[PDB]
């Protein structure tokens, strides 16, 4: 299904965005040490 | 401070672990997406060519 | 204090590794998308 | 507890690194899979 | 070949399973600090 | 075009090799604790 690829790729994009924010927060905690 | 830093290192690793867990779900979904392109080629491309 | 600084730097490097993996995933999306376009559009 | 916690943090990061090394291996194979699909569509 | 991609994808799945187990083990060590 | 997919895959391989070097450094630092 053309849209059922589209649903999957957008799941990847949202998870990729969440991952970047976790790394940003990790890095800032390190700055607090 | 030293106990304070050990606590901070722990929470930084916890955040790194959550970033990795997100990457792991992304990769699972990339498997699905590639599988779908390969299945699509096996299901509606090759039979269409035949027809 | 010396070991604490090493752990910090090790996590920092692990985090750089993860950032590189995040860019690789962004490009894998591009690669998969282009194959589906080539098979759909062209 | 100080020495005990440092060594635990070290092992936690060691294990996180093994998780990243597995993801790196997976990505490498995802390249092969994409290449394979485009290759089978061209040949 | 169709099965010689299927082998690759199955390897990625087991690699993914290993990655998940490694993160679980890291988190549980963190629980012991 | 397929030759201009090859560019994207090469970009992915380059980032993957950077990621591996970062993990290598992290593990080397941990060896020194």
């Amino acid at each position: 299904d053309p849209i059922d690829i589209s649903i999957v790729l957008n799941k990847i994009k949202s998870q990729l965005e969440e991952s970047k924010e976790w790394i940003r927060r990790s890095n800032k905690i390190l700055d607090s040490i | 401070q030293a106990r304070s830093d050990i606590e901070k290192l722990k929470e930084a690793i916890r955040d790194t672990n959550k970033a990795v867990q997100s990457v792991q779900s992304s990769i699972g979904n990339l498997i699905v997406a590639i599988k779908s392109v390969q299945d699509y080629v096996n299901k509606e491309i090759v039979p269409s060519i035949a027809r």
Side-chain angles (χ1 to χ4, degrees), chain A residues 2 6 8-16 18-33, chain B residues 2-34 36-50:
Chain A
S6 286
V8 163
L9 291 185
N10 260 63
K11 285 193 284 192
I12 302 167
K13 293 159 176 286
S14 298
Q15 291 155 337
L16 194 57
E18 185 188 339
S19 182
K20 298 176 187 195
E21 180 61 24
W22 287 120
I23 284 298
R24 190 202 74 86
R25 292 184 179 182
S26 176
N27 278 332
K28 291 318 295 159
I29 294 168
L30 295 178
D31 294 351
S32 86
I33 296 161
Chain B
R3 290 303 322 182
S4 195
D5 289 335
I6 282 159
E7 186 46 81
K8 291 164 179 142
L9 291 168
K10 159 172 176 169
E11 288 314 311
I13 302 163
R14 273 216 202 278
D15 289 341
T16 301
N17 288 349
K18 282 174 201 146
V20 175
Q21 289 181 313
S22 285
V23 157
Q24 290 162 349
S25 67
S26 289
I27 287 171
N29 282 328
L30 285 166
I31 289 172
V32 171
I34 301 167
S36 302
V37 170
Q38 180 52 53
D39 277 0
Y40 168 107
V41 153
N42 298 148
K43 255 176 136 55
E44 298 145 328
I45 291 301
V46 153
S48 74
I49 292 170

